[PDB]
Design a protein around this ligand. Sequence first.
Ligand SMILES: [Mg+2]
Length: 791
Amino acid sequence: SNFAPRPGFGTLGTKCIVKANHFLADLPTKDLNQYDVTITPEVSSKSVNRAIIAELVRLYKESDLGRRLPAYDGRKSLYTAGELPFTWKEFSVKIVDERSYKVAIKFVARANMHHLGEFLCPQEAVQILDIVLRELSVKRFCPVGRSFFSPDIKTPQRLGEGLESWCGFYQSIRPTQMGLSLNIDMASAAFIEPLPVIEFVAQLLGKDVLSKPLSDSDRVKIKKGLRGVKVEVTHRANVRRKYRVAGLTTQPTREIQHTHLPCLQVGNQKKASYLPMEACKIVEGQRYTKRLNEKQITALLKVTCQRPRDRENDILRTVQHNAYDQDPYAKEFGMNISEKLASVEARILPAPWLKYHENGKEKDCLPQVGQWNMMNKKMINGMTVSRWACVNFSRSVQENVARGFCNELGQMCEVSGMEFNPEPVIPIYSARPDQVEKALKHVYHTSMNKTKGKELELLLAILPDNNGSLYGDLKRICETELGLISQCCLTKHVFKISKQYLANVSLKINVKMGGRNTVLVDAISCRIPLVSDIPTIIFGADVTHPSPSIAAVVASQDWPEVTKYAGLVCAQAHRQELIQDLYKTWQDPVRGTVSGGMIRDLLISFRKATGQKPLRIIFYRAGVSEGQFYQVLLYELDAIRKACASLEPNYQPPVTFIVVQKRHHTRLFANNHRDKNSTDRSGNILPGTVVDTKICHPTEFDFYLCSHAGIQGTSRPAHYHVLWDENNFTADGIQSLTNNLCYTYARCTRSVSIVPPAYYAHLAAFRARFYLEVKPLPALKENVKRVMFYC
RNA sequence: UGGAGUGUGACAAUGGUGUUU
RNA sequence: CCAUUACACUCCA
Ligand SMILES: [Mg+2]
């Protein structure tokens, strides 16, 4: 059917003002007509075929069009302001490059206007606006994929050795409470720099060529750079042609004082044309597609990761130079936009109190800005360690330094709040990287032959800087068909022992061997709404594409805390959004219809872990497209509703889908960038910033939470589009729960951007690549299934 | 693979390519 | 311009 309508606008925290990149764009007021396109001969050739329509319009603008300028979609559509006098006419025009093309224009149907005004979901107004913007793009700028751009909107910075910056925008048209908002966001991509060939080559090779003899390496570099670059001949001014470059010659010019400069394969191999260098010019249309060295990489990254003030100013400059007003298409079409950034008055939620073990000189810690250290504190649950062995997989690290690091980690784990028994069961012996299977069963079975059945609890395994499938084999045979827990580190970290490194790996180990580390005061004192009254299992999900498209699910496993997330991973058909593996019913001869999947074998785990069935499910889906919400919301919910009625009949708790999307471009900036509204360090809105006002989907329920601190660049807010709910969650309730929950992250001592339930699913679906060998994945041994093996 | 954040295209392969110099 | 069969930077106590 439909989704869950928005219940209201919540109120919490300290209200403030944040400005975003959403330029208001009023829909036009003139009638629009749709005319089909039919061209013979029929070939795709989209760029060339658009020129056919352009020439047709230019030739017949007064004869038949009536001085009105049509809007051309390209592939199969065409739009016009008003109605043209004719209804069907045929004309033939030819591309200037020879086979003439005949085109017929006819009227088929017309969705005139106000198909989204009544909505504020027929996307006809959005589609027409997108078509108009794309026509403007193809008319004025040079498109490269979807983020088209051109210079003179900013001074083109020189990346180096003949490259150019050419910053530009990546717009989209999206319905919003404002009404048909425009979404200018800037993306940068290097382009090739026009220049006289002499100095161009001189700066490309770093030295002048006239004063030095030619060399093989210079020729290789020149041909690699110039393979595919367009060139314009300036030898004859009257005649100019778009001569393509096929390669570099291997013959001197003697076959213009530059005698030693070889010519080029002008045209192609069949047309052997050889001409000197200084009688030509470089065309700027093409884009650099080859590799960029790690000098130009840094030079370009300095531009695309500007501070948010420098980004909002650039975004505001893009439109003020785009000049949508006094533009022929808008004037003849009626489209009008604004030129100032959208202003909203969203509010900053407060950071939640966190409580630690009764020991330590402080049992409480509130995240000051959004990040807090574990100094002077201790974890809630410390899991004791009795048996553990260290295997070294490198030659640089010796028996002294490896054991020293391994003991420093143990001391750090002791001081962080768990027992770590030193003096390993089997001493390190620096196994060879090649005999991986032999070493990894030798270490496991030496204990069984020595300690009499005391299975290893933590097999430490230092590995070299470059994996080379060593990580894959190690942490594949270390959990498949051989149950174990590994905490592999890097050689470049063992020598550089740092307190932060040790105290952040200790946290992972403690949460990795069956325990928990931090918990909110509210969830343990029973004050979080809708989470602490009946048992809530906050799921997660993810689908990663690369070869089966593996997918993961992670659940919750306890009442007072929501910190432990054990989950399952599987494989299905290739490259599809929805996951068909949630509920599977194979046929059993002796039994009936055996029910499996993840949302059965993961609820059974919850029952075994806490003692009682869960009476509220929050499936918290992640990583889905913006247009196929419906199919996911259908299948991923029908699978749950059919699986829950299989373990025990008449049991269906209220689910609450919340799809999370981070791959969007709607930034948020603090209103006053000259005060402490930002984080006063690497400017950005304060960690925690819910924007549900004036930038959302008007008849739906979503928010642009920004719960993560911004270390560098502009923080990209997460878009928790809460699709379907049956808990009657308060709109402030979801915002408070989601901001308050992303502070219980295991590996970190910070607040993640996308929250742990939808972030663990991205790790469990990423680790299974190494396990992979429709083909079934190797079984995960029961030894590590309830214990978080990834985070 | 200590971890968070945000940055980018196959940092790279082979062959082929009409209106002339 | 057609056909073939994935990396860095920043920051942490
Ligand atoms: Mg993911």
